[model samples]
Target: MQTIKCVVVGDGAVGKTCLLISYTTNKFPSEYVPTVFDNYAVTVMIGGEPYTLGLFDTAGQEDYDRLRPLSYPQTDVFLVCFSVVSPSSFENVKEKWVPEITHHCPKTPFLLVGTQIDLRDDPSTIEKLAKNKQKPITPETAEKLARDLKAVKYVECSALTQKGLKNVFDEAILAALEPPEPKKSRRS
Candidate 1:
């Protein structure tokens, strides 16, 4: 059994801690209590291989700058979460969080998660409605943003209803386990 270290990084209110809790323990807090600068770790088995995912749920505020460095170095994969309900949080992914991850953990693989899909209509339908209502963050938009950020994958997950939760980890496990490409032969 091998352990794959994983972390979820995002701005506050984007449901980072909630998603982690849901995946690990099938639990979610009732009252939207924000996480303190704390880390939670659990072992999940995928294809009978044990992966010890260490989740460090940090505050999305600058006040917690000191704690950021402590956990950033050990991360193997980073799940960058943003809420479909909050465009500003999505914007912060590029503005604040991505830069921090690049600076701290340059080798980490990243996945962009659009959370709270349950709060809105279906992504495709939302795109149509957004055209009418002049407010939409369509699946296409999410994908484009993630592509620009160089994320290996992008998924929309709803922690509250547990929609698309399994797929998130399933894809993650595959991406994490696939062997890196061999370097070109240097024989001369």
Candidate 2:
């Protein structure tokens, strides 16, 4: 079997753990530990070969900023998460998260993930954002950032409801398996 290392990173306030846990376990977590969740694996089939999709979760706290890159050296892909309901996390996508990964693994493929979409669907959640004179991040806004940052794609999901959860990592696999050779768009 082959291995694909995927590291998830974003603001600590975002659901970096929730995303992986729910995807691997099919159950959303209620109480999470310090570093958040566990590293998980799922077997995926690609051209008749079974591949191990190793999903890793990373802490995004300001204090851990220096230590985060330790896990980037062998990462094949990255899931850059953010909370759609949290405007601050969204701002940090390009401000902090994107830059960190690009600096460490310049050629690695990554996807911009918008976690906690469940909040965006809640009536009270909308009101809460309205109170702060903000609103949930629209897909277009995130997709634009993905394009600007040259990410594989912008994916959003709610770990709580499992809405759009099962498939995000599938994209991660595809991105990781994507060929890297460049010859004027010709396949090698």
Candidate 3:
């Protein structure tokens, strides 16, 4: 059986771990715990061939900035994540996460993932963001960033509700199996 290495990276508390747990176990975690480096594996059938999808989880805190890249080598695909309700985290996708991954794996493909969509419309969540004069990120905004960053695409999901969850990994598998061609730059 073949293996596809997929790494998940994003801001702390953006639900990267919960997303993986919910997807692999069908259970939502009740609390948030900081992560360092952890991984999970699931067998997926792609084109009738069994493939081991190695899902690597990395800490998003600034403390790990130096240690994080150790996992970048040999990565097949990346899921750069941020919470839909977190404007700062969303901004970091372009400012930090994408650049970090691209610097390490220039030719590898990645998907811009928006997590915690279940709270995008929650009254408390909306109110909290409004208190800060912010709002949940819209799909259009994320999609534009994904295109600008040259990610395969923008995909959002709710780990609590499992909405659009399966599609995320399925897309990752497809991207790993058949990455899109790199864009050609026009020389002046």
Query: Tens-digit lDDT track for model 1 on 85-139?
Result: 7787788888987778867766667778899888767677467556667444567
Best by lDDT: 3
The list of candidate 3 runs beyond 4 A from truth reads 30-37, 60-62, 183-188
Please give the lDDT score for candidate 1: 0.71
Q: Give the per-residue lDDT digits (tens) of candidate 2, residues 88-178.
A: 9999989998888888887788888998888888899899989989999999899888888888888899888898887788888888887
Clashing pairs in 3: none
TM-score of each: 0.77, 0.89, 0.91
- Scored by lDDT, model 3 comes in at 0.86
Pick by TM-score: which candidate is best? 3
Query: For candidate 1, which ten residues in a row score worst on lDDT?
Result: 179-188
Task: Look at candidate 1 and tell me the lDDT of residue 50.
Answer: 70
TM-score of model 1 relative to the true fold?
A: 0.77
In candidate 3, residue 134 scores what lDDT? 99
Model 2 residue 159 lDDT score? 83
